[PDB]
Every structure is written in C-alpha cells, then in structure tokens.
Amino acid sequence: AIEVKLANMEAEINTLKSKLELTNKLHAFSMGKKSGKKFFVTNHERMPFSKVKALCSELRGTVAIPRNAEENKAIQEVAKTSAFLGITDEVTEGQFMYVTGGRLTYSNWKKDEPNDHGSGEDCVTIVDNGLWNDISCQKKKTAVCEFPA
Amino acid sequence: AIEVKLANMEAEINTLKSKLELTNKLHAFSMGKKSGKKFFVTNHERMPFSKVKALCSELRGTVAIPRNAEENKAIQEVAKTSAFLGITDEVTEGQFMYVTGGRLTYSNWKKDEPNDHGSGEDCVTIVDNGLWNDISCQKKKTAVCEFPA
Amino acid sequence: AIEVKLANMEAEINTLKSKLELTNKLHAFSMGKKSGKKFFVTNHERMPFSKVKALCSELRGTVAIPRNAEENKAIQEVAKTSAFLGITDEVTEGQFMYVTGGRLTYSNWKKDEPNDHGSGEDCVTIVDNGLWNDISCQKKKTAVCEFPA
Ligand SMILES: [Ca+2]
Ligand SMILES: [Ca+2]
Ligand SMILES: [Ca+2]
Ligand SMILES: [Ca+2]
Ligand SMILES: [Ca+2]
Ligand SMILES: [Ca+2]
Ligand SMILES: [Ca+2]
Ligand SMILES: [Ca+2]
Ligand SMILES: [Ca+2]
Ligand SMILES: [Cl-]
Ligand SMILES: [Cl-]
Ligand SMILES: [Cl-]
Numbered sequence A, B, C: 001a002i003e004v005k006l007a008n009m010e011a012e013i014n015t016l017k018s019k020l021e022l023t024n025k026l027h028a029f030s031m032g033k034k035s036g037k038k039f040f041v042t043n044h045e046r047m048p049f050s051k052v053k054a055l056c057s058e059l060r061g062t063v064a065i066p067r068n069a070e071e072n073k074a075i076q077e078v079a080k081t082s083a084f085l086g087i088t089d090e091v092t093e094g095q096f097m098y099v100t101g102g103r104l105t106y107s108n109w110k111k112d113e114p115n116d117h118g119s120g121e122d123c124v125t126i127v128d129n130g131l132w133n134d135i136s137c138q139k140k141k142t143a144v145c146e147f148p149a
Helices: A002-030 A049-058 A069-079 B002-030 B049-058 B069-079 C002-030 C049-058 C069-079
Strands: A039-047 A083-088 A123-126 A132-135 A141-147 B039-047 B083-092 B095-098 B123-126 B132-135 B141-147 C039-047 C083-088 C123-126 C132-135 C141-147
Touching: A002 B002, A002 B039, A002 C002, A039 A049, A039 A069, A039 C002, A049 A083, A049 A141, A069 A083, A069 A123, A069 A141, A083 A141, B002 C002, B002 C039, B039 B049, B039 B069, B049 B083, B049 B141, B069 B083, B069 B123, B069 B141, B083 B141, C039 C049, C039 C069, C049 C083, C049 C141, C069 C083, C069 C123, C069 C141, C083 C141
Parallel strands: none
Antiparallel strands: A039 A141, A083 A123, A123 A132, B039 B141, B083 B095, B083 B123, B123 B132, C039 C141, C083 C123, C123 C132
C-alpha cells in the first residue's frame, strides 16, 4: 500500500530529525558548550578576517563576539592565541559595530586602543591577555566561531 | 512513477541513516572512545545532581558510573575535577544504588566516607584523585555523562 | 495528497542531507581540520595494525599516510605517541607500499631503517620525533585515521 509506505517514510524522517538534533546536542556538549550559553569553536587556523567570517557563516555561526567578561574569558581560553572578533569599524571609521548589527557596547580595549594606526585598522583581535587591539583586517589571526545559546 | 519515486526515497533515507551512524562513530572516536569501552564525555560545567541527570538523559546517556577500577580512572581523567557519579542512597541510607538500578558493587570511597555529613549527603562525587566522597545532591559538581561501549 | 506528500518528503530529505553535511563540516572544524588540508584523528588507543585499518575503514577513512614533511609533522602532533602509518611491505618483503596502493613517494626513515629486524617487521610507525621505523604489525600503536582535504 502506497499510503502505508508514505506514512512509514514520515516516521523515518522524523526519527532522523530527532537523532540529528541529538547528534548536534552531544557534539556541542563535547565541545564545551555550557547550559544556556553560546559556544566557541576554533580549528586553530589563522586566516584574514573575511575568510574567518565566510567560514563561520558557512557553519551557521559568526566570528566570536565577547558581550561581557565571562564570554571574553571563554573566547580567550578557546582561541589560545590572538583571534579576530566579530567587531569592525569598516562601515564608518571610529564606530565599531558587531558583524551581526549594532554598535559596540561592552569593550576590553588594551591601553591606547582603538587607534586606527598607520594606514588603518578596521578589525579587532583579542590578544593573549584577553585584551583587544584594532588591527588590519588583512592580517592572519585564529578563526574562532560562536554558536547561539 | 510514484512507486519508483517512493522506492528511491526510501533508499535515500537508508543511506542518510547510515551516514548519520557514521557521524556518530567518528565523533565518539575523536572524543577518545576506546573499542569495547564506555564513552565518557563532559562539557566541564558544574551543576546540581538533578541537572546532570536531566542533561545526560537528554543526550541519551546517564551520569557516569565506575563499575571497576579501569572505568573509575577513565572517568577521573575526563572530568578533571570533582564530578557527580550516577550513585545515590536516597532510598535506603547506606544502601547506595546506581541511577540505572542495582546495588553498588565496586566503590572507591575516601577514608571516613561515606559519612552522610550534616543534614545528609545522598549523592557521590569522584574527587580529583579518583577517591569518592558522598555529597549533598543540591551541590554543584562537574557533569560527566557516559554512553554504552 | 499523495504526490504533494511525496514532494514535501523529497524536500525534507534534501534539507536533512544539508544539515548533516553541515554537521560533518562543523565536526571536522572542531577536530582541527584546516582549509584544503587532509586531516588526522585519533582516539589515542593502541592496537595492532590490522585493527587500525579495520577501524579507519569503518569510519570511511584510512590509516594516516604522510606524503610530505608537512603532513608527517601534522600526523605526529595528533598521535602524540608512536602510531602506525598506512604503509607496509607485507606483500613483497622490502617493498614498502601505501595501504591505499602505490610505492613510497616520501619517506622519513630513521637511520638503518627499514631493516625487517629479527623475526620480521612489515609495518611502520612514526616515532615521537617524526622519523620512521619499520616494526611488527602485531605491536599495539596509536590509531590515527586520515580523512580527505
Ligand atoms: Ca577605516
Ligand atoms: Ca578603524
Ligand atoms: Ca591598534
Ligand atoms: Ca539518606
Ligand atoms: Ca546518605
Ligand atoms: Ca561526605
Ligand atoms: Ca615480510
Ligand atoms: Ca619487512
Ligand atoms: Ca626496524
Ligand atoms: Cl583594515
Ligand atoms: Cl543529599
Ligand atoms: Cl610484521
């Protein structure tokens, strides 16, 4: 019977949707995602900003963005080295915005940053001490993506 | 056409089920699962026993349980900190049982443990050195889940 | 209904196929896979060569094979301890071939290796320092699987 097979197929598809959802949960858990918190992942590869941005988006995430000290600390722990943050002032010099929209609020600028040094610096990296430095978007820094809570 | 379409979709589904099964195997492997051994994993987050139980159960797992000295060590090195074990004596004081049912067989209690200190201590935690301590279930310890061998 | 349901189910299947691809990409990413580079994974378990092969085949990969100094170091950094390479002279004594077929193109043999020492040595392990030594395929070494770029 055609309808019986179709009904079975529906059940099979729904069963797969739930198993996949579980696979995703377990992987996030195994990757250190904390309950009700965003999770950060890195392959430890250094690349220019646009490449990090393209990579994270492909994975359905975004370049990591610290919204407070806890998150900033978590990103630093994950990155282990200087990494790009999802913050830039490429649209209008001086006004840093999140790659996902909106003006930068919480910050952790290193002493004397941001300074748009020399020919210009429109991207931001969280350096080893967790402090921030605006740098050239063309420099290669560790790719770190964040995924929703 | 409908009979063929349906037949070909069922085949697609079977391939996808196998592919998902592969993803699960590769993930466990990457997370250090040893052949014929249970898979222990943690996100490194500390919480009350009731939560770890709910969390592990949501991932189709249970709170880690050392059935012998080998598994007890395996759990210790995964947790890195004091983690809840799937054992409590909430039913009969002194009679510790696994959350999955059954009487406690292997144990690695610390000197003077269990002591059911203060108002009571019905949960168990494997402390840093692998030794056990009975502790209040309302306290917050590392969440470590186990998955079948 | 029937054809509408069937059309929806094809859409459901394709959507699920994309989500799973996404899941695999994110896992490879978290597993340290760099762009355009093959990647290596290990559960850190020691086992005879035949088991490494079986395990990697089940994961749809192959035993790690270094094609150049770049990959040789990458394999060594993942294994951390001596691991089997997908290279053996089992078919014809003295003729080292890749498990995937073909004669060696790159080699980092430690001085005086390979020597088929004593009762015989047909497998190869990358020692902690990257050099190669032919050893017994019966010995238990770290399993490192290789996945395509
Ligand atoms: Ca500018
Ligand atoms: Ca600027
Ligand atoms: Ca600067
Ligand atoms: Ca009690
Ligand atoms: Ca008690
Ligand atoms: Ca106690
Ligand atoms: Ca031989
Ligand atoms: Ca030989
Ligand atoms: Ca030798
Ligand atoms: Cl720039
Ligand atoms: Cl208690
Ligand atoms: Cl041999």
